[PDB]
Amino acid sequence: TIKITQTRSAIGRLPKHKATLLGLGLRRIGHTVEREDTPAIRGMINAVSFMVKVEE
RNA sequence: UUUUGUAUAAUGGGUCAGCGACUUAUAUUCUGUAGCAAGGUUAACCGAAUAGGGGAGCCGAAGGGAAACCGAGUCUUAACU
RNA sequence: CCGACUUACCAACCCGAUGCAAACUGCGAAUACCGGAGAAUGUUAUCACGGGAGACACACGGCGGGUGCUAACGUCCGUCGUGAAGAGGGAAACAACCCAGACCGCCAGCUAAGGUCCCAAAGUCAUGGUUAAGUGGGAAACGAUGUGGGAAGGCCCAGAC
RNA sequence: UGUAACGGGGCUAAACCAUGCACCGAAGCUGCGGCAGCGACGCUUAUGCGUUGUUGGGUAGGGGAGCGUUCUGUAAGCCUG
RNA sequence: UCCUCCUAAAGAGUAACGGAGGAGCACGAAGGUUGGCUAAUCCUGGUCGGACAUCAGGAGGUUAGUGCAAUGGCAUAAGCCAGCUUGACUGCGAGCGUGACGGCGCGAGCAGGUGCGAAAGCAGGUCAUAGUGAUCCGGUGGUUCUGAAUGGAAGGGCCAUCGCUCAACGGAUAAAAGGUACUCCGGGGAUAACAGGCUGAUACCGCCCAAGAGUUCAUAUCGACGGCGGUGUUUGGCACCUCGAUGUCGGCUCAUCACAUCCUGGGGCUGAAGUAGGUCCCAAGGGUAUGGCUGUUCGCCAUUUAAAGUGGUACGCGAGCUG
RNA sequence: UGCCUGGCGGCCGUAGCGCGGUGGUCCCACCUGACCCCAUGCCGAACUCAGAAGUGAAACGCCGUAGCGCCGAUGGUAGUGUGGGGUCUCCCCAUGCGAGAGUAGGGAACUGCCAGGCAU
Ligand SMILES: [Mg+2]
Ligand SMILES: [Mg+2]
Ligand SMILES: [Mg+2]
Ligand SMILES: [Mg+2]
Ligand SMILES: [Mg+2]
Ligand SMILES: [Mg+2]
Ligand SMILES: [Mg+2]
Ligand SMILES: [Mg+2]
Ligand SMILES: [Mg+2]
Ligand SMILES: [Mg+2]
Ligand SMILES: [Mg+2]
Ligand SMILES: [Mg+2]
Ligand SMILES: [Mg+2]
Ligand SMILES: [Mg+2]
Ligand SMILES: [Mg+2]
Ligand SMILES: [Mg+2]
Ligand SMILES: [Mg+2]
Ligand SMILES: [Mg+2]
Ligand SMILES: [Mg+2]
Ligand SMILES: [Mg+2]
Ligand SMILES: [Mg+2]
Ligand SMILES: [Mg+2]
Ligand SMILES: [Mg+2]
Ligand SMILES: [Mg+2]
Ligand SMILES: [Mg+2]
Ligand SMILES: [Mg+2]
Ligand SMILES: [Mg+2]
Ligand SMILES: [Mg+2]
Ligand SMILES: [Mg+2]
Ligand SMILES: [Mg+2]
Ligand SMILES: [Mg+2]
Ligand SMILES: [Mg+2]
Ligand SMILES: [Mg+2]
Ligand SMILES: [Mg+2]
Ligand SMILES: [Mg+2]
Ligand SMILES: [Mg+2]
Ligand SMILES: [Mg+2]
Ligand SMILES: [Mg+2]
Ligand SMILES: [Mg+2]
Ligand SMILES: [Mg+2]
Ligand SMILES: [Mg+2]
Ligand SMILES: [Mg+2]
Ligand SMILES: [Mg+2]
Ligand SMILES: [Mg+2]
Ligand SMILES: [Mg+2]
Ligand SMILES: [Mg+2]
Ligand SMILES: [Mg+2]
Ligand SMILES: [Mg+2]
Ligand SMILES: [Mg+2]
Ligand SMILES: [Mg+2]
Ligand SMILES: [Mg+2]
Ligand SMILES: [Mg+2]
Ligand SMILES: [Mg+2]
Ligand SMILES: [Mg+2]
Ligand SMILES: [Mg+2]
Ligand SMILES: [Mg+2]
Ligand SMILES: [Mg+2]
Ligand SMILES: [Mg+2]
Ligand SMILES: [Mg+2]
Ligand SMILES: [Mg+2]
Ligand SMILES: [Mg+2]
Ligand SMILES: [Mg+2]
Ligand SMILES: [Mg+2]
Ligand SMILES: [Mg+2]
Ligand SMILES: [Mg+2]
Ligand SMILES: [Mg+2]
Ligand SMILES: [Mg+2]
Ligand SMILES: [Mg+2]
Ligand SMILES: [Mg+2]
Ligand SMILES: [Mg+2]
Ligand SMILES: [Mg+2]
Ligand SMILES: [Mg+2]
Ligand SMILES: [Mg+2]
Ligand SMILES: [Mg+2]
Ligand SMILES: [Mg+2]
Ligand SMILES: [Mg+2]
Ligand SMILES: [Mg+2]
């Protein structure tokens, strides 16, 4: 279980960068989401690391 | 208004008041609603007459094949699992 | 005839070394594309049918290219973003650049881009060096004892310069 | 055409390359109140009585719900010197 | 109109008046099967015989060949020869690929009847990708499907098939050229010329090395073979503003700004003895001609001037004039 | 159980070339002859038949040799997906992927089944 938050917009981003946020459940700026720790979530975090921040 | 793009030095209007631009008939398809239901429904017309009669007639319940023709099967081909 | 020779010259095949090619690959990625399984999330976001449209004049920016002068806010193709159809802050002004997607109201607070001397809201903030040209605040080949450094080298107290 | 290649004043830093701590800075995010749609759930529906999550920029265009005027029936009713 | 490669950004596809080439056929064998075989080139030797015909070996290993243009493939050969034959058959077709669609292509396998091979097996056209044209209309053959009172038939219908460089090749008609400055309408700055805008291939100007010319000596003064920049001044590229009008070349009057200055002013070098000169730097305060020719700016000539500038202002200025 | 040989395979160069030796009990190859089965665009050269006198010369199988071919590291370089930048017809930073060429080096194949001859 890890905590993720979004800190940047998804306006000029790629479709694969917005679908990643859709999969992570992020809705807007500063949306705190709890997600299970798994290689899939880690890969998503690596993919959108420039706009997300983890609390661990 | 037209444009990728108008404060544009692209067009329109001096202002006010009145008038002014997806309507009508018939025919077909679709949606909702209402009656009836494997049936539904009349037109012309008669009728003192929005009643009633008139089911002539139209759609659908059975389709296949060009057509004869056959039939919940048919055509295709001498014959097709 | 046959030829004996060298000779201000050029040069085939092969060998050794150095390169080039969108229409050359004995080599060969990253990305992208097809399919399967799996956890999580997304208002089925997917497909099929039926009713109704609108549109087929796009532009700019990034990356990958052709034609141009490796010129054009030039033109032609692929991908993404924006405008078109998107308000707001910033770049002094600015359709396409950056941040960021306006349900409404509040004389509440927190931030991103971008800034904190005044216009104009915020540090005349602290330590550390550079610049003396208003460089900052438009530009090249090239030239110069301009300085701020780093690493070496020659000559040199029998005397260098 | 008139400074006119920092926006201007002005700056020997208020310029640049390096470190850090603060602040300003948007319709971005958080706080309060209010409206509407979709979907889950028990409302045994009153089709709404609480929840909860989410969404609500918008041209052409599509869908849905509505306001206003004339006349007609309700209406020999009602208001009105 | 159709075929091959690249551009085409390693799935497919993907444009330009982009770069390179082809097709509008041919074959009863150049098809199928069975059986067998492997060259291009070079070297050596040998009669006519030569660099190269034919014959022997050796090296080489597809560097040849594909009926054709290119690409992808071909040794089990798809290449090269011989024999036998017509599967260059009929009716079907699981399941796919590609297209907006019409449509096109690959196809295991089924029923009948064949060819080759002893047989297993192969053959529903050529190694593959171009060799092509919707519909209507009309013709031919066959067809027991129809046959307008009945029996026939004409005609029509199903199958095979024929006729179109419809080449503008998804084809508007069975058949079709030009002028308008006598002109006209709806429209476009979606699209033309002057002008304005972006860039600067061209134009002008500036700068760098120095081979040299310069009686010796590169740089008093010029400057090759080459290179780097500036103005947006010419001829030009794009077509972003304007076609429900921004009036255009030249001339007259009227000027203004700039300096890469024609004179005046000051200076450096000089292959500057002096006058008179050449080159370069600063400097825009002022001035900067009259006539013949031509509509002309430009330009030629005559004669002056201390000098008779370069360019911008919508190639300045027509709600100032001229035509 | 070993050695050698033949056939059918697996993989397709660390598997292939070249140099030097070895092998004939058996197998294999070379080899003898041909009216016949059969054939040569002529020819027992090839195919095929009847045989084993002779030979391991050639081919073939085996052995060792690095004159070639071949494989091939680690590290580094180019390139590149995503996000930021600069002096932007070209590069840099952060995080992942990571070549090719070349060097050191490896390397004279391995193996399955069915058969034949000699030892056991
Ligand atoms: Mg956990
Ligand atoms: Mg326009
Ligand atoms: Mg504006
Ligand atoms: Mg317009
Ligand atoms: Mg206007
Ligand atoms: Mg107009
Ligand atoms: Mg007007
Ligand atoms: Mg109805
Ligand atoms: Mg019927
Ligand atoms: Mg059936
Ligand atoms: Mg290439
Ligand atoms: Mg997938
Ligand atoms: Mg069109
Ligand atoms: Mg178009
Ligand atoms: Mg376009
Ligand atoms: Mg454009
Ligand atoms: Mg580009
Ligand atoms: Mg351009
Ligand atoms: Mg602009
Ligand atoms: Mg254009
Ligand atoms: Mg539009
Ligand atoms: Mg905006
Ligand atoms: Mg948007
Ligand atoms: Mg703004
Ligand atoms: Mg600006
Ligand atoms: Mg502003
Ligand atoms: Mg704050
Ligand atoms: Mg900040
Ligand atoms: Mg202040
Ligand atoms: Mg201070
Ligand atoms: Mg001035
Ligand atoms: Mg605010
Ligand atoms: Mg908000
Ligand atoms: Mg609230
Ligand atoms: Mg809305
Ligand atoms: Mg919103
Ligand atoms: Mg009434
Ligand atoms: Mg491709
Ligand atoms: Mg691709
Ligand atoms: Mg053939
Ligand atoms: Mg054969
Ligand atoms: Mg000869
Ligand atoms: Mg060829
Ligand atoms: Mg053949
Ligand atoms: Mg059969
Ligand atoms: Mg037979
Ligand atoms: Mg062919
Ligand atoms: Mg016709
Ligand atoms: Mg008759
Ligand atoms: Mg009959
Ligand atoms: Mg015809
Ligand atoms: Mg066509
Ligand atoms: Mg007109
Ligand atoms: Mg235009
Ligand atoms: Mg023009
Ligand atoms: Mg204009
Ligand atoms: Mg000389
Ligand atoms: Mg021009
Ligand atoms: Mg005009
Ligand atoms: Mg006008
Ligand atoms: Mg005019
Ligand atoms: Mg001067
Ligand atoms: Mg002055
Ligand atoms: Mg004075
Ligand atoms: Mg005279
Ligand atoms: Mg003029
Ligand atoms: Mg004039
Ligand atoms: Mg005027
Ligand atoms: Mg005249
Ligand atoms: Mg023997
Ligand atoms: Mg023999
Ligand atoms: Mg031997
Ligand atoms: Mg490596
Ligand atoms: Mg990048
Ligand atoms: Mg390597
Ligand atoms: Mg290597
Ligand atoms: Mg060997």
Swiss-Prot record:
Subunit structure: Part of the 50S ribosomal subunit.
Keyword Ribosomal protein in record: yes
BP terms from Gene Ontology: cytoplasmic translation; ribosomal large subunit assembly
Name by which UniProt lists this protein: Large ribosomal subunit protein uL30
Gene designation per UniProt: rpmD
GO annotation, cellular component aspect: cytoplasm; cytosolic large ribosomal subunit
Organism the protein comes from: Escherichia coli (strain K12)
Top-rank lineage group of the source organism: Bacteria
Additional comment: This protein is located near the guanosine triphosphatase center of the 50S subunit.
PANTHER family: LARGE RIBOSOMAL SUBUNIT PROTEIN UL30M, MITOCHONDRIAL RIBOSOMAL PROTEIN L30
Record keywords: Ribonucleoprotein, Ribosomal protein
Family: Belongs to the universal ribosomal protein uL30 family.
CDD domains documented for this protein: Ribosomal_L30
Keyword GTP-binding set for record: no
Molecular function per GO: structural constituent of ribosome
